Design a protein around this ligand. Sequence first.
Ligand SMILES: O=C(O)/C(C[C@@H](O)[C@H](O)[C@H](O)COP(=O)(O)O)=N/O
Ligand SMILES: O=C(O)/C(C[C@@H](O)[C@H](O)[C@H](O)COP(=O)(O)O)=N/O
Ligand SMILES: OC[C@H]1O[C@@H](O)[C@H](O)[C@@H](O)[C@H]1O
Ligand SMILES: OC[C@H]1O[C@@H](O)[C@H](O)[C@@H](O)[C@H]1O
Ligand SMILES: OC[C@H]1O[C@@H](O)[C@H](O)[C@@H](O)[C@H]1O
Lengths: 345, 343, 339, 345
Amino acid sequence: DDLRIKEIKELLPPVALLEKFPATENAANTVAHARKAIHKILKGNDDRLLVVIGPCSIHDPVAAKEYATRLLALREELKDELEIVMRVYFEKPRTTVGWKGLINDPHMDNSFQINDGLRIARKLLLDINDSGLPAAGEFLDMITPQYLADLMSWGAIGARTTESQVHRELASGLSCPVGFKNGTDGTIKVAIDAINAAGAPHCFLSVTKWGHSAIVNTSGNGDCHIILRGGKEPNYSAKHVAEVKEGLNKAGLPAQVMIDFSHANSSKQFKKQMDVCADVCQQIAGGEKAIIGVMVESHLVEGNQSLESGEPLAYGKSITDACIGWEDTDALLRQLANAVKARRG
Amino acid sequence: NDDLRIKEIKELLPPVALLEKFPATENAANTVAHARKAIHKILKGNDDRLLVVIGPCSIHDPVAAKEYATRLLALREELKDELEIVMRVYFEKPRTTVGWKGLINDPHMDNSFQINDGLRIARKLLLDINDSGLPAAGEFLDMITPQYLADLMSWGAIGARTTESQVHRELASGLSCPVGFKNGTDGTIKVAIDAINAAGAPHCFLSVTKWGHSAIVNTSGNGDCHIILRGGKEPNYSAKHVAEVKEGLNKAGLPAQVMIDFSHANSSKQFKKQMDVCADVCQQIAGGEKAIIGVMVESHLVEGNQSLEPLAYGKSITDACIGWEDTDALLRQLANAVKARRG
Amino acid sequence: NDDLRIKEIKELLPPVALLEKFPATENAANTVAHARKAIHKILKGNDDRLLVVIGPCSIHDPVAAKEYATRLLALREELKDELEIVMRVYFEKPRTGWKGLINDPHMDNSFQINDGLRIARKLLLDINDSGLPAAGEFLDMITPQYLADLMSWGAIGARTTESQVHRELASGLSCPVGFKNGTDGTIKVAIDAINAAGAPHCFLSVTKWGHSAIVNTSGNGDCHIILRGGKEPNYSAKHVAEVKEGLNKAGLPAQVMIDFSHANSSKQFKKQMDVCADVCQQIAGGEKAIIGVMVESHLVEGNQSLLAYGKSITDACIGWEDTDALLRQLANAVKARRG
Amino acid sequence: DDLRIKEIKELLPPVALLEKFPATENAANTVAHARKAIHKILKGNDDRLLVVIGPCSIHDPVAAKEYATRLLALREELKDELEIVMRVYFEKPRTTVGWKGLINDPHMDNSFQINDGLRIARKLLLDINDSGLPAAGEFLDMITPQYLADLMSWGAIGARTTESQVHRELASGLSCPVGFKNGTDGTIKVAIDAINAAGAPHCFLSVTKWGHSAIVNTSGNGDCHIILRGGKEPNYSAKHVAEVKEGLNKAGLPAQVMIDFSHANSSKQFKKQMDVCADVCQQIAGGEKAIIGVMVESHLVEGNQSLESGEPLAYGKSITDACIGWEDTDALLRQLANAVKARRG
Ligand SMILES: O=C(O)/C(C[C@@H](O)[C@H](O)[C@H](O)COP(=O)(O)O)=N/O
Ligand SMILES: O=C(O)/C(C[C@@H](O)[C@H](O)[C@H](O)COP(=O)(O)O)=N/O
Ligand SMILES: OC[C@H]1O[C@@H](O)[C@H](O)[C@@H](O)[C@H]1O
Ligand SMILES: OC[C@H]1O[C@@H](O)[C@H](O)[C@@H](O)[C@H]1O
Ligand SMILES: OC[C@H]1O[C@@H](O)[C@H](O)[C@@H](O)[C@H]1O
């Protein structure tokens, strides 16, 4: 047995990270209030827009904290219209070879220093929540969340695993609202199945805070919604939104969507997120109540850059997918806030 | 801000406990080692026989399963020159939404989730089957269960709904057995091709050890992986589709070899039509198609299925299967097609 | 500033793995459950029979041990109206040499502890399954999780009677526990131990899952003294009366177990037969405070160094003929004491 | 199983406490230097006296830190003569039953909040070492050492466990020097056997920093020595010291002793530690080289007090054995330093 398993190394149990970086009272309040605010929006009891916005992935805690400071100030100013949550993702999932993210490779040197990465990742989440800014995460696996989910106010399940039973089980026990992405061809069937599955109670094997496998029972997660992220062609338009609202009603689910402005929805050209924003704002200002959230890939400095062995990097600029910069980000957030005003007034 | 949707947490026996209680016998270990070697030889293109993965959609009754195994073992022996027969022993079921997830998750089928019981039952059965001399195949859905059973598995499948899944591709990369990847539920071949490439590469990721502890594990990569055609919007078992897949495989620099699942979307969810698929596939094989190295059939003692009162004997409680009579005949057809292809 | 003096760390099977591989049969579970009950009644003073723990100094050979167990079981059934016969199944001889069956089951200094645990639990299981209860010695706080469920009685090591961690262990054991008196023959430490082990405790221990945890115990009211001599033997009627007075003064039931071996026998194995005659006289004469004895016995008498069969490789024991005689003598004393 | 086991509760693994409270550079320096200093003394390459001195038990971090400040000042002033290490004892062996100490029951109300106790104990040990003051402990429990041993410069195995094989095994793998007390009846042989046992490599069952049981192999610890703590009568006097030196040499060990001024050497009368001090000082000034260490029970305020009365505790005063107060401690330390200087002269 174990002929294709080469070596096994020690992993800090979640409780070690929880003890080292405990939620402050401010941090816990940030998380509790944002989860509640998002629930309220999902129930239709609040007409504000959930905005999940931030870097494609975090490679530098310094830049991430400056970004947080900037975003926090807009969160405060636009709070009457928007529930602003910072995107704090640690990995860009990909087919090709490349950087495995901040948890796996925090020192960006193609080694795996996961114990280091988990420390760095938790400490960043802690600092951001502690400043008053809520965080959104992505769940790619079953083990990472035990280290980090207590600091997450919203989460997405990876696009390649919306159909996976193990990832749906995960969602059904998460303490935060959860977004499920539509199919790569832009169909919503798999995401609807995922929402149903996740809303149900489940019993399954998982790793506990003590780093031991155990049998776990979940209550089911009713705060799960679809994320529209395009198929071949984009799917943010008033037409596609109507199609999805129809499918959702037909399935017995609340007719609400989050729209991902990036990638397929913007033809993989970062500046085009501004065109998606313009269209989406039009729908909202017109009277669309079903768009309950959006997601935008945004950083201090626009564009992206490629990681290169022994060379320094531009500050505040993505090393994964290209993002809009701060200037566009400020304009975009203001457009959405104004759109939310216009909708009700 | 923790544990609000976690209702209860209960003790789980570690793999090492199941391994100690139910160690592989000499025979069990022999069966596994030979079958893995034999499938490898088939995948390398150095043996012209056909890998046949056949058995129930799911195991729910160890007794019926042991009878089934007794019968199949005879045919495995009789047809050994044409077919490498391996029994489906699926303890885990991916649901489209919700439902019974299999023997391990709920051995008593009453939503009591006696998983410790399920693990003991499943290992005992697997051990017994291998000990008689019949190799076993299972779907690896769960990230934590494989440590309790894998040493007794001769071949594994990653389901259509998890072929795109990073963690499952990592799992495959560390499995000691050959692994098949089903095409996507919409019929997409690319995802499985990416899966094969990913699983052949070494990985480093979080997993659970034999002692039940989470750890960082490094895998070597698994070169014995292949695609499983299982249809999409329409069936994809025909020579036309096979031609396309072989082409797609070559482009990706992979060996042009397929396994064909006769059931699911390929039979339009109608169990009888597996006989039709069999007819068509035997044609391609008899006609000279060497790229078809394997098939997968959903088979039980009694055909059809039932809903989960006590239950009817020998009948699937999940997907509908063909009965034993059709099974014996299906297998003989396949062996004859292999006869034809050779000489 | 860690692990300078730690050379190597190797994986240890958790107790659940040995519990799962070697579960108690119905017969084994009944043997343990009944012998514990019986011993309790003797200690409570509601049964006039005598507990007899008897067997090899240490087990090095499972085959010879199972042969001994078979012979003893016959005498156990025969003398059951007078005697509660329990086999001594000790896997190590504490000393300042061979590290015992659990540490070195292959007798070659290779420390195959996972093997030793399997062999020890298997042996214990077979003995209990046949109907013969077993007595163990608890030298550490981890070993018991693997074997304690197949033990109807246990002794705390002489060297650890004073130790708070071993007293804590005793307070949570399911079986009755014996505490040896002091090397100088005094009983103060053993009286402290019994009082400590009788109270509930909270302390860190390792679970059946092989993880450390916080454990709370109820306290063990089934602890008693074991007289094993000091500078001089302390088995005489004089000494028993002294010990009884101290127990009474300390508000403890005035009862003792007497070890026939070692210091009480001046380190000569046949002298165990002398202690037997002395103890028998006391019992037959009407001494009710003697509730048990401990005897070092094998198939073949004497000992040897590191190989003859069924002969001790540690301290010397009486052989099987003396053992038959010794057990009958005791049974006869109990008849005389009773009617 | 489980018949006399009432409850089993989760325990933080040592890695959790090490991650939450890692050694600072200065704390690590304090430990490294003190261990090296003690080793040099025990090898006979330094003529200074090891002095282990402090409370019978710690029950209050605040008084403990005030005490440490005062002791550190004298450590600095007297360091040419004395290697001063503070008694930081978190575990207490009871004759029968009683409060087992801060780790076992930090809130002193039989709530047994051991997780709290461990956090409190490590943090205190860290603070003391960081200030520059090395710490000594008693190693009683088989599981607790992993939580604290990295911050200990010296350890003792109590009189009631000197004969215990698992304690000798523990010592054989400890990274610090270790004193073994003579028997509670005054027997010397058990401690000599302990020293020899501890010097040898062992293989035995223990618990790792992950809180898992395992098989460990140790190398043996050559930095062990005897502690003279009295018997039925005290054994600190010259006559007794000569007997012990001879016994040690006979067993092939260097003739060296630490003398505990308290417990049976003071007939459990706390002020008699000053009389023991006078006699031991005369021995040392007279030219006795074998006395390499002493141990003294000392607190801010002399005497002791009872937990069970339910009266609010007086500050800086022992709730276990009675100690000398600060003013006597200062005097006693100066006497010892003067004696060491005379010995050298
Ligand atoms: O075993 C296989 O080869 C499978 C998995 C398949 O059997 C699935 O578990 C059920 O079809 C669930 O059915 P439902 O759609 O009722 O959840 N192929 O897809
Ligand atoms: O700290 C030491 O150096 C010790 C241990 C000692 O302090 C013990 O814990 C109490 O004297 C027991 O007190 P009691 O007899 O009240 O349980 N030396 O023996
Ligand atoms: O963050 C840790 C995770 O990293 C992912 O990239 C990997 O696929 C997972 O298996 C897990 O190791
Ligand atoms: O490290 C800074 C220190 O500050 C002190 O005031 C406190 O008593 C210590 O516990 C520690 O926190
Ligand atoms: O049975 C295993 C035990 O063996 C003892 O000899 C040893 O002192 C204990 O620590 C433990 O290892």
